[PDB]
């Protein structure tokens, strides 16, 4: 699952 | 389209230029930031990509805020007289106007200021590029249609 910066 | 003359940056130099890549993956627990998995994939891709373009690429990893500051200040003091332009790529965590070092946070402006015309005269009239991969706040774009 995509993660955020 | 058409390549009009006096409207293009002069690329006729011994070399295209330097390409600094700051690949920040790990951070001190006290910043509350997590590991940025997938960042090595980007750094590798970017490096191969810019080398191909003609830049002299350098990759730095897990830098502290002081390291990032010093590293960039030193690049702006080198002689760029024979380079067509300069490039820097930052991969890390961030908040509005700020980028994370493993240490904590530092202002983007202070990192790039080292290359203003008056502080880095060998890059004067030459394009100075900065690609930033970091968050700039916490708002989410839900989309439409």
């Amino acid at each position: 699952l995509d993660e955020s910066x | 389209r058409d390549r009009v003359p006096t409207y293009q940056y002069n690329m006729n130099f011994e070399k295209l230029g330097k390409c600094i890549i700051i690949n920040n993956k790990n951070f001190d627990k006290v910043t509350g930031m997590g590991v940025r998995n997938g960042t090595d994939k980007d750094a590798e891709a970017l490096f191969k990509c810019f080398r191909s373009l003609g830049f002299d690429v350098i990759v730095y990893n897990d830098c502290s805020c002081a390291k990032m500051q010093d590293l960039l200040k030193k690049a702006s003091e080198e002689d760029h007289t024979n380079a067509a332009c300069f490039a820097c790529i930052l991969l890390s965590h961030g908040e509005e106007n700020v980028i994370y070092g493993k240490d904590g946070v530092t202002p983007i402006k202070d990192l790039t200021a080292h290359f203003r015309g008056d502080r880095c005269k060998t890059l004067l009239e030459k394009p100075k590029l900065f690609f930033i991969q970091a968050c700039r706040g916490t708002e989410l774009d839900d989309g439409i249609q």
Binding site: X5 | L124, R136, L140, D142
Partner: protein, 93 residues
């Protein structure tokens, strides 16, 4: 005879002010993926602004965040280019 000290700077941010930037653990950040993709294909023959506009379009269209959490599910991203350049930029010739 003079030149502004802030001139000839170009900032390609992966996202607009105040927002999140998405990164895939297996493929990497959306912005970097897209950028490299297009640079490999057109870096030697497109102006820098054409390249970034196309990167803008690719991140905007091709990507959509997937997460178990409903709050961060199916969200989008749009890069942000800030130019102070005074000429057109080509990486060749």
């Amino acid at each position: 005879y003079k030149i502004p000290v802030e001139a000839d700077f170009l900032f390609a941010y992966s996202t607009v002010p105040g927002y999140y930037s998405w990164r895939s653990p297996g493929r990497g950040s959306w912005f970097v993926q897209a950028l490299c993709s297009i640079l490999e294909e057109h870096g030697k023959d497109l102006e820098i602004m054409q390249i970034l506009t196309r990167v803008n379009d690719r991140v905007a269209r091709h990507f959509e965040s997937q997460s178990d959490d409903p709050h961060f599910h199916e969200k989008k991203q749009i890069p942000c280019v800030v130019s102070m350049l005074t000429k057109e930029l080509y990486f060749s010739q």
